[PDB]
Amino acid sequence: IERVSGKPLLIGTDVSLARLQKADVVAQSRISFPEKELLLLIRNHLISKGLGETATVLTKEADLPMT
Amino acid sequence: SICFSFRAVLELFDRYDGLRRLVNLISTLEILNLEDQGALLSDDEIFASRQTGKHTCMALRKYFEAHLAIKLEQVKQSLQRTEGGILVHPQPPYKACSYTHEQIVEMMEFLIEYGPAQLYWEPAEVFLKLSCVQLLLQLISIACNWKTYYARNDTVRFALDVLAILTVVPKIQLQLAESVDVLDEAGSTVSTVGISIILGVAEGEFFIHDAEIQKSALQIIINCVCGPDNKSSEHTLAKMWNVVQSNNGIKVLLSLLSIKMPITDADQIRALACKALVGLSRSSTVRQIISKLPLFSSCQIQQLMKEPVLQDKRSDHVKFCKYAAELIERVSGKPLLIGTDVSLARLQKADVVAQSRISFPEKELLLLIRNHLISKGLGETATVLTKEADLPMT
Amino acid sequence: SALWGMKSVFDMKHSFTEDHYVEFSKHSQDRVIGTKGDIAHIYDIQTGNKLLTLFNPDLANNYKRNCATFNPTDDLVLNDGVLWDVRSAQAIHKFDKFNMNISGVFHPNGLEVIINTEIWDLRTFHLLHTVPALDQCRVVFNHTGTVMYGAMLQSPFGSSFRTFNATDYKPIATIDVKRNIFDLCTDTKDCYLAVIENQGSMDALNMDTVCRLYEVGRQ
Amino acid sequence: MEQAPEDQGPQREPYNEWTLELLEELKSEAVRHFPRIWLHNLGQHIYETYGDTWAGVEAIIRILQQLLFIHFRIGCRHS
Numbered sequence: 001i002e003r004v005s006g007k008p009l010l011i012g013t014d015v016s017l018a019r020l021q022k023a024d025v026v027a028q029s030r031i032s033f034p035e036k037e038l039l040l041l042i043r044n045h046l047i048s049k050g051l052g053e054t055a056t057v058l059t060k061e062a063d064l065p066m067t
Numbered sequence: 068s069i070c071f072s073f074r075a076v077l078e079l080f081d082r083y084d085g086l087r088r089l090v091n092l093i094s095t096l097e098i099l100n101l102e103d104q105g106a107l108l109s110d111d112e113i114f115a116s117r118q119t120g121k122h123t124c125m126a127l128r129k130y131f132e133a134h135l136a137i138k139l140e141q142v143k144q145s146l147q148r149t150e151g152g153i154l155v156h157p158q159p160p161y162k163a164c165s166y167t168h169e170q171i172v173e174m175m176e177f178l179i180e181y182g183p184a185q186l187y188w189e190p191a192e193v194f195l196k197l198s199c200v201q202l203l204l205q206l207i208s209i210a211c212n213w214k215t216y217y218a219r220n221d222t223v224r225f226a227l228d229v230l231a232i233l234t235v236v237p238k239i240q241l242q243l244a245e246s247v248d249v250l251d252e253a254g255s256t257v258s259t260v261g262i263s264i265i266l267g268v269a270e271g272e273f274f275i276h277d278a279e280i281q282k283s284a285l286q287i288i289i290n291c292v293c294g295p296d297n298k299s300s301e302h303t304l305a306k307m308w309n310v311v312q313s314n315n316g317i318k319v320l321l322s323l324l325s326i327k328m329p330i331t332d333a334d335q336i337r338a339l340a341c342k343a344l345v346g347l348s349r350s351s352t353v354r355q356i357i358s359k360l361p362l363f364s365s366c367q368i369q370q371l372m373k374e375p376v377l378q379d380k381r382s383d384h385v386k387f388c389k390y391a392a393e394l395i396e397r398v399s400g401k402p403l404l405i406g407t408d409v410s411l412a413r414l415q416k417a418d419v420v421a422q423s424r425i426s427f428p429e430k431e432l433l434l435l436i437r438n439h440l441i442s443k444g445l446g447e448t449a450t451v452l453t454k455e456a457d458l459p460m461t
Numbered sequence: 462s463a464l465w466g467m468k469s470v471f472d473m474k475h476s477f478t479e480d481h482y483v484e485f486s487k488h489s490q491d492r493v494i495g496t497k498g499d500i501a502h503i504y505d506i507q508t509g510n511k512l513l514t515l516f517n518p519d520l521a522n523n524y525k526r527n528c529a530t531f532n533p534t535d536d537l538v539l540n541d542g543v544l545w546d547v548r549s550a551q552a553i554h555k556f557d558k559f560n561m562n563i564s565g566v567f568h569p570n571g572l573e574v575i576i577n578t579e580i581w582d583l584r585t586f587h588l589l590h591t592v593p594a595l596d597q598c599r600v601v602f603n604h605t606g607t608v609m610y611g612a613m614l615q616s617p618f619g620s621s622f623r624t625f626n627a628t629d630y631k632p633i634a635t636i637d638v639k640r641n642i643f644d645l646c647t648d649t650k651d652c653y654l655a656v657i658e659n660q661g662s663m664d665a666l667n668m669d670t671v672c673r674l675y676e677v678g679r680q
Numbered sequence: 681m682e683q684a685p686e687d688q689g690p691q692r693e694p695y696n697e698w699t700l701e702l703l704e705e706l707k708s709e710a711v712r713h714f715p716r717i718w719l720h721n722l723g724q725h726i727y728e729t730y731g732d733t734w735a736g737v738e739a740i741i742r743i744l745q746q747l748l749f750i751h752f753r754i755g756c757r758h759s
Binding site: 258 | 518520522555557558559587588589590591593
Binding site for chain 4: 466467468471472562616665
């Protein structure tokens with residue numbers, strides 16, 4: 001199964017042939033994302049779990065859309 | 068058989084004796100009188116008498132095919148009452164027998180299950196006070212073995228269609244087991260329940276090459292096992308669960324779930340087989356029994372991946388997969404309509420992984436937050452994050 | 462069927478003209494049961510009368526080879542795949558038919574019922590297990606009840622053996638006996654297998670059926 | 681120390697008569713389960729090869745009881 005297909009490197013996952021060409025493309029994809037989509041989640045975490053005296057200090061490092 | 072379309076014909080029919088004149092024609096018949104079947108043997112009183120019973124089964128068919136649409140008008144207008152209906156009825160003579168047993172006379176038998184649950188037909192109570200569903204059971208049993216082509220294929224095919232329209236009454240499903248006065252191929256008076264005859268027709272032990280008769284048989288089962296959710300009417304469905312399971316039912320349905328010899332309607336027999344299981348797998352005993360059989364060891368998925376007749380692939384094999392996914396859901400740990408890891412060993416994995424209680428301390432995230440913010444340049448909160456929590460690494 | 466005598470004098474000490482398969486009672490051997498068709502008769506040995514004939518017409522499975530047996534506590538009978546409490550002549554629980562031939566047997570633990578390939582319970586009546594290698598084979602247990610033997614009854618009959626475990630039903634061995642196995646009995650003291658095998662090809666006109674003794678546990 | 685029991689069972693001293701008391705009976709059941717085509721043909725096949733010499737007389741009671749056992753063993757109700 002390994003030789004006639006898209007070369008799984010000895011991982012036991014989705015052994016069917018239609019599911020094998022899925023896992024080649026998903027693993028070799030180039031996932032990227034901007035920094036904003038994380039820093040707004042970092043700030044919305046730190047305000048939530050009480051630890052807030054870096055949140056108004058995080059406004060110094062980046063724009064803050066939501067108070 | 069043609070004039071039952073006009074509703075004025077049917078109205079005058081019950082104004083006279085009607086089925087008292089019509090059922091008495093069947094109860095006169097000498098092919099059916101087992102006490103007198105070995106007296107007359109000439110071909111004139113047999114070839115015509117096995118034809119007289121043929122046409123009267125079609126007359127009873129076209130009778131109850133019409134009254135099924137008469138009382139459906141008295142349910143879609145009496146219960147809905149403008150909620151999905153229009154109240155326009157000047158009583159015209161109109162042909163409304165719906166004319167399609169393949170699609171819509173089948174469909175009216177399903178949609179009547181939103182009925183009153185205390186249904187009361189004059190076409191039912193006149194039938195059962197005569198108590199000739201036992202007669203119709205005897206019509207099946209005697210016509211099992213003629214082997215001489217007196218159109219006996221049709222004579223049982225019309226006879227099963229008279230049953231399946233009647234079975235929407237709850238009190239007649241109860242009499243598919245009680246009255247047992249029958250006869251079989253031993254040349255001997257025996258006694259057995261009605262369901263075993265119907266399940267026998269579904270197998271192919273009798274009526275060997277016949278195909279529509281099997282689909283006519285399976286409709287009688289589905290009307291008794293795939294009913295409504297609703298101490299008494301639930302007990303009535305459970306009593307039918309107890310009778311259908313007792314008379315070797317679960318062997319038959321698994322045999323029809325892999326039928327391959329009638330390759331034209333092999334898809335239609337399997338979907339009507341699997342719909343009977345999904346109804347019957349709401350019985351508490353049957354949940355455990357079907358859970359250990361080799362249907363749920365493997366090859367349930369292999370009946371849903373081969374796609375045997377590709378002409379019904381977007382038509383009828385896709386609906387066999389619809390009824391079969393509901394059977395996998397019921398006998399297992401309840402996936403809430405998510406298509407994931409459909410195998411049974413992989414299904415109990417996903418129940419535990421989804422219901423686990425994942426927890427983690429706050430430290431394991433805040434050290435990752437700080438190690439991110441120092442990494443991507445934005446560092447004048449990191450020494451401010453030391454104010455909020457201990458920092459192990461500079 | 463004839464209850465003979467083997468002390469020193471050989472005589473039909475009681476005679477039956479009816480039953481196709483007679484069988485003792487297991488623990489207290491004073492009872493002999495036998496079955497014709499779907500009707501199973503309980504006999505005594507002392508007087509040979511019919512003690513209690515048990516049958517329910519509303520409930521039988523009508524197996525092809527019905528053989529009513531006893532549990533090792535001498536209280537339950539498998540006639541037609543129906544249990545029977547022999548204290549008051551009543552039926553207990555019909556099973557579901559699946560295989561058209563075999564009416565079942567008791568497992569020596571007194572906890573289960575082995576219909577052809579379906580393993581049942583005696584008090585909860587739940588299908589515990591399903592061993593597909595038990596497809597139409599007659600079963601013989603050890604005297605201790607620790608292993609199950611299997612001989613195919615498929616036309617050929619028994620192209621091999623089938624060695625099973627009595628606890629988890631895991632297959633131990635299928636030793637290939639090239640001839641056709643017709644019957645199989647084992648020791649009480651676990652040393653030999655009495656094996657009726659047929660020589661030649663599958664010939665119904667010429668049958669050379671010999672007995673070949675095996676030894677347990679030797680290469 | 682096992683003493684095999686004394687054979688005081690049903691003896692068969694008129695073997696020329698007990699055969700005749702049962703060779704009809706071997707024919708009295710094979711016709712009740714099988715057509716007479718093989719019955720006369722196998723009886724002729726041994727009579728061309730064993731004749732009237734008792735070496736077909738017991739030998740047909742061999743072959744008939746060897747088939748009527750296995751035909752009640754393979755799983756045919758009559759045949």
